[PDB]
Amino acid sequence: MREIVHIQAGQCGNQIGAKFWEVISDEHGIDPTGSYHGDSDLQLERINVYYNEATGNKYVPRAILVDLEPGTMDSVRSGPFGQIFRPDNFVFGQSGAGNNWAKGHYTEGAELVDSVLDVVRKESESCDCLQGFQLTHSLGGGTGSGMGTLLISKIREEYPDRIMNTFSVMPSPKVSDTVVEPYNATLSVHQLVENTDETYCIDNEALYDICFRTLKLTTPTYGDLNHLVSATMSGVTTCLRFPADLRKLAVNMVPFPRLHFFMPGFAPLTSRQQYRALTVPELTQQMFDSKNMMAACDPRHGRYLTVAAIFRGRMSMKEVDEQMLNVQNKNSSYFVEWIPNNVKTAVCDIPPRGLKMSATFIGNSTAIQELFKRISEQFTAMFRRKAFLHWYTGEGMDEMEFTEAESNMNDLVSEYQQYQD
Amino acid sequence: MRECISIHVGQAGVQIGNACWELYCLEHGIQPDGQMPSDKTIGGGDDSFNTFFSETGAGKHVPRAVFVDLEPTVIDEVRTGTYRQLFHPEQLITGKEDAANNYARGHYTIGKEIIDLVLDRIRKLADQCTGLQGFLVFHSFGGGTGSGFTSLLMERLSVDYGKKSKLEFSIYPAPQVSTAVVEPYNSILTTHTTLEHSDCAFMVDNEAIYDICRRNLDIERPTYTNLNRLISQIVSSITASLRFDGALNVDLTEFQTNLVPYPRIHFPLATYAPVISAEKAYHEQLSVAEITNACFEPANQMVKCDPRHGKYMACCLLYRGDVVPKDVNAAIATIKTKRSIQFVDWCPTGFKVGINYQPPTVVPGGDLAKVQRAVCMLSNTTAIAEAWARLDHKFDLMYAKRAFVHWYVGEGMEEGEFSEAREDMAALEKDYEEVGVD
């Protein structure tokens, strides 16, 4: 009984989190009211990892919904699987965060953080053996970025020896709400560099290009972007929900404590020629292709420290090994040669809803430094002129704190750069 | 009669332990409920099979075994599997979260908290023995429990049972069946701290078992069940002398005597033949010479290496089935004139031979076919040092960058224990070279 406590904070965090519980609830045969109605025991084997079992064989997700304004979580409560969440696990304010990291982390968020931790403590205490935590949020806003990182900090204080895992949506000027996103993202990345064991970097620009160029969606929406994040979140967690361990995963994926920012990938990504079968070579060629990755980083600009793949569906496991060992042995210049056998492959028999077989890609690549470089550049472009700083200094923050975040992220890039050589 | 307590540590040791004890029951005519009709002394006796099974007043034959794992999902199979009735609950010990492939986590962090409990359950088994021989310890090199808790258990066993022999069955890490990148660290950490505490250790390279399963058994993608059943045949061959009437390797002390002239060099190479697919229409039964000659084919060694370029310090031939000494010597003579068998000048050029007339037992519905005769060769070649070289090299690649080291330091291990352990393996590699090279 290795339980995971899930937390979703802010607009992005709850909208992406909502669809995640909608996707896996479908895979485990849980309907919108928590009643199981599947046809396979594999669906219930690892069901307690993400679900609590209530009276009457009801399964309630182990999720804590957090936000500083009531709007988004009212949507979740009214959405498809809204009724499946525990009423007491909705913790929210009324002031909002104004896309301000200082408001979510020091002022507004600080007033609300304790009531969230009471709910976390309530869920952890009822866990037979808590694996760790997973947080979904964006870094470019205020609540999921500012307060999200405040939560991670207070969770690591109370549970220092539990794994802290996040799915983090990185800002991008292409799909950007406010100009202060570089500020909020830079301030959060430093928190994540210190207090998370694994962070899956999701770039809205990558999610956009996939929806535009690959999926052929003329006008992508946030909903379309979240469908990709749901499908990815379901893929990376397949090892945890079906017939392994968060700490075991971290051990084999993270060779250096600060370089724990992953690039995920999904395959297939077909446009509506959607019924055609996808051979194992196609799953493998696409899964490693940059166009299938959501970090908006060209892996051919760096090197993989470690790579993990999960294949879902009834396929030729012998042919899986042949194709994976073909991508490695045909591009080994992009894999560091000082970590032997740093490419691992796993198979799961249950495919996602509506796919005969799929493949999820998880890579610890030094190409991710390109993401932090872009953020660092946008940060400096405004900070050199102190543009929009008054929004943050008005919440008690000092310019010194910005100068440090800048340096912290530039040190992070220097660290990635040295292992790429 | 002297008893042998088997200890299974980690997932690899528990599942291999499960496969062996299943085979032992099939060999000794013991049913899943623990009953043994052929045993006419109800609730007692000092037969050869009593070295591995105790008896209750109710005629139950209980393995002298302890299963230890830091996480419970693997032992729970034993608790509810076919042979759940053989063991009582005190013999099955499971924690709630594993060592996460982290040696330091199994040796220090978790091991510290569970070591005295294991020693207490083992003491209970020892209290049923009128003359305990020692322990057989099954574990993996790569797992965090298999490596980290095993080495702590060996250190304590040397304290609590100083005059008892300890043998290992160690699973050498292979990328084809492992998803852990840090197993080279764990393998070298545990070999370092276990070396002075183990009298004789049988390494099984998962890479070897895997190809034997693909090649001889035509299993395109073998599973742990396939590997474990094959591994339990070799284990059964190696422990048969302790469980059956005989005169060769009749107690654990005789393994070091016949196979280990130098204490540090206590890693015999195991070679088994024949392995025949049960799905075959029907195989031509191989002769004593043919299966003996197969013992010098790299393709059926438990560790892939080239004995033609090492030196033999010892050599045991353990035959099971329709074999008479006349055929053995005929095959040996023919093999000397053809093969490359160079012994160390300070060791005789001979072969200790043991024959057990009962042919190998095979689990029904298994993968191995029923053969009329089989042999398992135990030879102490310097050629097995290749396995240390390979493993030591992978260690060096990662340790040069300190990759993954923070995970061990974070559990309380000092970084110097890495270099101290690597230096010990470098010495171990030097010993093999001083012995087998001119």
Place this chain on the structure above:
Amino acid sequence: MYTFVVRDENSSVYAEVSRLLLATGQWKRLRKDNPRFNLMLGERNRLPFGRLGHEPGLVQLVNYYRGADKLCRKASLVKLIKTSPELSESCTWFPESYVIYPTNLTDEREVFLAAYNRRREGREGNVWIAKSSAGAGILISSEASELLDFIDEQGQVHVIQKYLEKPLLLEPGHRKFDIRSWVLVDHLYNIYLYREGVLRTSSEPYNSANFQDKTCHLTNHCIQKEYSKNYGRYEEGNEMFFEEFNQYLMDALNTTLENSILLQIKHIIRSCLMCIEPAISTKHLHYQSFQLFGFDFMVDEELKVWLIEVNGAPACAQKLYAELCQGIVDVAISSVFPLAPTSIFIKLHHHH
């Protein structure tokens, strides 16, 4: 797309094979420490054989046979011949040799002196030659005292073997020579003999009354091009190829190179390689091996061929690099890793 790694930058042969492999556009070279390779052009000394053939899903091939040093070492070759029933001690094509350890260190000092005293007493030609693998350091002499005292002044194992006092001398010139044959053995242990050989000739007239000046007795390409004053006079670079040497044997001796010499060469090549096949074969191994060999022969005035030594890392004649290196890729490398004639070799069939 196949991958190979280079671990011997000083290999003129495999520098060409590597150059050719890249030219096919279907071979990709990797860093010398990258384990995910199909082909390894390995180092001469301490090649890590124990690390080959352990990469999942990679058929790995190496250009050296583990154990061939038994054949390509002065003292090793002598012990192999004297202790192998296939070669026996009465091997008729290998000069009477003895392994002698310097007195500052089994050893055949006494056994060499017995055969020496026998020749001295029987009025027979008693001129021997001392040499070792640690040479560029050779000594030719008819006195046993000088031979043994020369090895003690050194500190490595040496070998004393009979000096062919009646070598076949080319005319005009009255000059010694040796024959270099290139033999490629593939992963299946087929023995291919390069149709092209070279005679490394001495540009100085052979002089049997003065072994002090070693420029007319030693036919090494470096000694002739350094201490010989007639270098390149009769043939370019003191190198005569089989076409010229064959025509000479017809005009002078009324015989052919095939009948008078090549039959014995092919016989000697087979005998040496078949002997060690059980020890070095990679038939049932987890990796495959091939290797190019340089066999060195001497020919006496009776047209009897003698084996001098076997080089495990030989170079090639400048004019024969292209053809031979291509042959290595064709039969040795592409036979295992095919790509998307009239062979240059002579298969020396044998029983495996």
Place this chain on the structure above:
Amino acid sequence: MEVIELNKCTSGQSFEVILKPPSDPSLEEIQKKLEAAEERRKYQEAELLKHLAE
């Protein structure tokens, strides 16, 4: 090629063929190692909490 020490019984026999003649830490010290690593874990967690408290 000599055979020696031939032992026979109902379930088998064993012998020896020769082809050629020839030519710890105490319980206390373990506890110290374990308690030292536990002390290093406690110190590292104190620095983490001290960091978080700052």
